[model samples]
Target: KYKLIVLDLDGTLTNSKKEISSRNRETLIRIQEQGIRLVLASGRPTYGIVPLANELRMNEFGGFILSYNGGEIINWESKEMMYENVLPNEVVPVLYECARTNHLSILTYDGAEIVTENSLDPYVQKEAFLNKMAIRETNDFLTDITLPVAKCLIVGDAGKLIPVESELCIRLQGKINVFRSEPYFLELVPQGIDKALSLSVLLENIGMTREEVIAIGDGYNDLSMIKFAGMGVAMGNAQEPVKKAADYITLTNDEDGVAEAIERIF
Candidate 1:
């Protein structure tokens, strides 16, 4: 009865090797053939999410890309940007100050590249590697970031970032949104954006309902959508909170958790 399957990329779709295994790929293809549409959602930038969308043959199956944790949504088949939200250009200096004061590495996407002052930061490196995007290290962050950006990431040691997360929560209170996609990677996005909110928008545009959707995820960011879907699935490797929020718990990503979830459904 499910007409839509919304998936979070990092821990839910790609396994330890950062690759979608053949088993999962075939399962998704089979589901698409059976008429269930797909949406690949993540905190990753659009460029990072497109490869998987293409690999899934989203162009043919007519899937969507919900990138930047919900900041942007694009229809793959029509290549139309259906919705986009960017942080205010004035907010850049404020975000930069917070990162600099905390001695953290700050980065934002400029097209397909990660523009940061410290491209050498290990977490920044991991972000770059995960997205397969080039890191463009800018010496003057304030001067370089004049264009609109979907979000800004404040990355550092988890211990150091914890306080910054709390600080930004109050500082940007009603002005912007801050959340942790990972312990070391705290993100800043436009207000009122998350996986669930974006999925709701996509559903409206596509004429689907929450009862016809299944959301599978493993992170704290996935919580909203997981709770919003009809069959909210938590991966075996999902964080504790995510597990508690799911309708069913599937195998670990390493064990083909996504395929397992679909197998039972089909």
Candidate 2:
């Protein structure tokens, strides 16, 4: 029996409309009530994850959330921080320079809102829309970044972003982890801070093994946790590579994929 169920938010838990359906919500609550853990894992920040966790009543059942692609883990009920990793301050300017040179827009969080050099960038707009976070424009994002950030996002056209992603991975190979959460959104987080690594930490703290966990996701960034789980499930709408990596493929998110997986497995 699975003791923990780790879910990726955007494309796995939320439908294409970007809302968690009543079917999914009810299923999750039932699982939690049965003493199974529910973990909300996403590339989004803690601020963005909190609202969803509340909607699911994770805090009432001792659930947890993995935010910033697992840069931070927090206990839902006690609101205790389990672990955290942040991007190096020195890397901030380097990232900003790279994005500027590549004609891409870069963004980081200012605790409650997105901080970017250009709020008008369509990709920035899309991020703001998806995360439901406000954007705060700054002329000097490099200097405006006062705290150690958990991650940074570089957004651009898919075609243009491909080369940028390649070049960044090559340039920052050992210094950081660079990957795309979406075709147009290249994400950079601290070295060795993917979902698997962080989840391993949380599992150890809670005396749970990786083999007792089930992971469900649909994006490239979700690959690590998916592969790390005892049972890895991909949504039917997942990217081709992601589908190939999964142990099982479920219905699409719009078809109640998460609920279907739960009913079949648990």
Candidate 3:
């Protein structure tokens, strides 16, 4: 029997508008009733998962969260951190410089508030709106910032993001892991970090094996875990590459693909 299941947000657990369907929510609760561990593995930060976790009533289900694409693992009941991988002090300035030169908007994390040197950038505004967070503008990087940055986000046109991604790989390859959460958004996390790595951390902490886990995702960021899980399920709306990486592709996200997967797996 599978003991753990990891789910990707946005395209997998949620649809295009970033809302989790009630059907999928009920399916998750059903799995919880079966004593299966449900994990929310996503590129979203802790703040982004709170409302959803609360909506799922995760505490009753004995749920754990692997947030920030595995940069952080938290226990819901105890409110304890299992893992945290953050951007180093040395890399922050370089990131700032990169964004400034490329005309990209940079958002730095300070645990509680996201500080942007400027909030007028269209992409930055859109992302903050999408995540339901207010944007604070600040010039100070360290002093004005709060403790515990979960992740840093850079936003711009895909063309700009692509070059920045390539440059980041060449310059900070060993320093951090660069992922494109969306075509216009680039997330920088600790090196060797991804959903797969986060899932491994989760498995090790829970004493579960690879064969006992299944994952579902729909983007490049979701590929690693999808390919690594025992059963890598994909949403029919997933990208072509993601579909190819999946062991099984279910109906589209709008059709309640997550519910479909659970029905089959159970």
Candidate 4:
């Protein structure tokens, strides 16, 4: 019997326009009323995912959110931190220098703003637009950053970011995770903060097992937890790699993929 469902917000749950189709919204609320918990996992900030969570009635159902690419897990009902991790302040210079080495811009979140050195950069603008957050640019970003940050995003052209991605994978090897959620967006999360890790921690504390979970996603960032779920589902529109990792494939988010999958599964 499945007790929990984890969804990746952008491509897995929300349509291209960032709205949850009414089919999905109604289906999710129905399931939650039956005592099943839901989790919204994303590389988005807490602010970005909150409004969506509320729309799903997660706060009323005691749902959890895996935000910042699983850098933080929170229980909406109780306002509790299920698990929270951050990239230590010490490595910011390394990240800054490496991004500077390639002349790319770095971004991090604070409250509802995306703080970056170049707010006007189109990639930065897109990220902010997707999250519905404001941009605060600083000529000297270091002083503006506090001791620890949830994660850092290095934005650039996909082609230009490839080598830097590999380089950081080698440089920060054991200390941080270096991966691209999208071709052009390289993410820097602390070591051991993948979706699966946090989900496992969440399950253990909640007295549930992995076999009772269903995870779904379409992005590379969603891979870990999708595989970690008892039943891993891939969207029909999911990237090939994610589809390959899934046990089931459902319709596209626009077609109410999550609702379709749940109807059959439940």
Candidate 5:
């Protein structure tokens, strides 16, 4: 029996529009009451997670958040980092140069804040509005930044991102953890960090074993945790790669796939 559940926020727990279902909310509360711990594993920083944390009344359910991929583990109440991995300030320059080479927009998270040079991008604005996140607009992220970055995000056309991902992976191998979230978004977190590594960290801290963890997600970046978990579930609307990585599949996101998966598992 699983004692821990690791959840992917976007496209898994929430629908395409990033809204959570009432059924999912109630189901999660029930699971928490059953003594199973739930940990959120997502690319979002703790700031983006606060509203959901409050919605779930997380303090009553074993509050722990794995934010910025595996870059940080935050206390839901104290809003403090229990552990974190930050990209050096020096690395920001390298990333900026790399982004320029690929002609992409860069988004960054410093565990507590989000920064980007392209605040005009409609997509960025939409996401920020939906998540109630603050985006600091700046030109020189390396010198002007005060906080340490947990993740670096590059977004644009899929065609461009694919080649960029290939080249960056080859160039930064062993130096960073690089992967794509959606078709058009490539992410870089600290070396040795991903849902798989973070899930293990969370489970260990919660006194649970790998065999007692179940994970769900619906994107390329979520492949690792979905494959590594004991019960890895993929949404019906997930990308082909994500589906291939899952041990089980549920209904589409529009039909509340996560709710169905939770019902099946429990």
Candidate 6:
């Protein structure tokens, strides 16, 4: 039996509309009441996860969030940061230059606000809409990057982003972790930081083993955690590679896959 459920927000827990359905929410609440820990694992910032966690009453049930694609882990009940990893400040400008050369838009979080060169970019607007975070347009991203950045997101068309992701990975190799979260979003975080690595730390802290966890997701970035869990479930709408990596393939997000998985398993 799984003692914990680690979920990816966008394409796993939420429907295509980006909202958690009543069936999914109620099923999770039932599981939570059964003393199972629920973790919201996503490429989103902490602020993006907060409202959803509140809706789930995560704080009341001691749930946690692994945000920024495992850049940080926060305890919902105590609101304390359990772990954090940030991009090196020196690499900020380098990433900015990389994005500029590739003609991709780059953005990062300043608290809950998104800092980017083009606020009106469609991809940027999509991110802002998903997180409900305001976008701050700036001419000098390097200068605007005052705080320690959890991660950097380079956004563009999937076709264009594919090559850029490869190039950036080779360029920043050994210095940072670069991977595509969504087809259109290439993400950069500190080296060696992924959902599995971060979840390992969280598990050790809580005295639970990977064998006690069930991870569910539908994106490339969710691959690591899915692989790490005792039972890894992929949504039917998941990318081919992700589905191939998962132990089980459930219904699609629009079909209440999360709820189906919970009912079948827990």
- lDDT comparing candidate 1 with the true structure: 0.90
Instruction: Give lDDT tens digits, candidate 1, residues 116-183.
Output: 99988999998999999999899998777648899899998889998988998898887787878778
Candidate 4 pairs with clashing backbones = none
The RMSD of every model to the true structure, in order and in angstroms, is 1.9, 2.3, 2.2, 2.0, 2.9, 2.4
Residue-wise lDDT of candidate 3 within 79-120, one digit each (tens)?
A: 888898888877887887898898788886555456797788
Each candidate structure's TM-score, on Cα atoms with residue i matched to residue i, is: 0.91, 0.89, 0.89, 0.91, 0.83, 0.88
* Candidate 6 lDDT, 158-186, residue by residue in tens: 99988877887888887787877678888
Cα deviation in Å at residue 230, candidate 1?
A: 1.6
Tens digits of per-residue lDDT for model 2 on 1-266? Answer: 78999999988999989999999999999989999989999889887887889999999998898999788999989989989898877778888998999988999998779999999999998988888889999998987866788989999988998887888887877778888867889888898778888899999999999889999999887888888999999999998888999999999999999999999997
Please report, as a residue range, the 10-residue window in candidate 6 with the lowest summed lDDT. Answer: 173-182
> How many pairs of residues in model 3 come into backbone collision?
0
Model 6, stretches more than 4 Å misplaced? 100-104, 157-167, 239-247
lDDT of 5 at 87: 74
Task: Report every candidate's CA lDDT.
Answer: 0.90, 0.89, 0.81, 0.90, 0.77, 0.89
Give the local distance difference test score of model 2. 0.89
Better of 4 and 6 by TM-score: 4
lDDT of 4 by residue, 182-250 (tens): 788998989877789889989999999999999999877788888899899999999999999999999
Q: Please give the clash total of every predicted structure, in order.
A: 0, 0, 0, 0, 0, 0
Off by over 4 Å in 1: none
TM-score computed on alpha carbons, candidate 6? 0.88
lDDT tens per residue, model 5, 49-150 = 777877777777666788777678876756666677877656667777888887678877643456778889765565566567888888886665665677
